[PDB]
Design a protein around this ligand. Structure first.
Ligand SMILES: [Mg+2]
Ligand SMILES: [Mg+2]
Ligand SMILES: [Mn+2]
Ligand SMILES: [Mn+2]
Lengths: 133, 29, 133, 29
């Protein structure tokens, strides 16, 4: 049971071959459990303006567990994570990453990603990661 | 409206179907 | 009863002379209803790293109505808003702006702001705004 | 932990108290 960050889904959907893309293809082929934070779903649904593509990708993500954020609490924690990292010298580049981390730490799973932001969060908050650069 | 969840092979077929933004761009337009 | 975007709160906290800052000060002085989306709260809470300043700003926003997003639905709408705007030739710079707009359209209020992203959303989706440049 | 909501004068006293980022910066770090 793990969270797959937007960055890996983008690698998968992009026309380029990469380890992240191969990793997600394998995981999809194995019927492994993928956790989809709603904010990741949101990011993925803007990659193409075509509404039929969006609808098809909405069904792609619906195959897995679309996990809802905890109201108010995940947002507060996301901000606390961002502050903590910034005191430690790292400015996390997206609050969405922080919300994803807030969820991961709350439910106790790792985050698969191709985004150094999560390695910063790992350093300061201990977030379990599977980096896929 | 949300359609029916994709099957395994349906899901696999969308690999490489395209994305307009890199992740870095997604995080800052 | 309206949503006050992060941009106005930032103006309020940054100077005492801008239109946006003065507008919010007046609204606060009049005890008017300010709707604070949790994502706006989140953005505001990262502006200073000191936990005591953060706690104080947390209490500032608690004076008003903190409204949680509608789980999944606001995120879907936010992405739909982003896609519609982009088809219209406007790339909205923040998905958080789109979540705020999705909430506003859902509960039927206007958004007070100093961010041209919302005038883009107004153009393509009709969102009521009070621009404060 | 969430402290007591600020009173009106307390809230007004925070005008101009500082913010490390412009709105542009907060939307693109
Ligand atoms: Mg991200
Ligand atoms: Mg914004
Ligand atoms: Mn990131
Ligand atoms: Mn914006």
């Amino acid at each position: 049971a793990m969270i797959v960050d937007t960055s890996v889904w983008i690698a998968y959907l992009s026309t380029s071959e990469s380890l992240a893309s191969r990793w997600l293809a394998d995981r999809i082929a194995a019927d492994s459990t993928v956790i989809v934070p709603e904010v990741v779903m949101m990011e993925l649904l803007i990659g193409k303006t075509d509404e039929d593509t969006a609808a098809l990708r909405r069904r792609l993500l619906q195959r897995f567990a679309i996990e809802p954020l905890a109201p108010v609490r995940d947002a507060e924690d996301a901000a606390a994570i961002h502050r903590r990292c910034r005191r430690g010298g790292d400015t996390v580049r997206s609050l969405i990453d922080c919300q994803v981390a807030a969820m991961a730490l709350r439910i106790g799973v790792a985050v698969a990603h191709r985004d150094r932001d999560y390695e910063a969060i790992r350093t300061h908050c201990g977030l379990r990661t599977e980096p896929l650069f | 409206l949300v359609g029916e969840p994709l099957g395994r092979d349906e899901a696999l077929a969308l690999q490489g179907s395209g994305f307009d933004f890199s992740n870095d761009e997604i995080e800052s337009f």
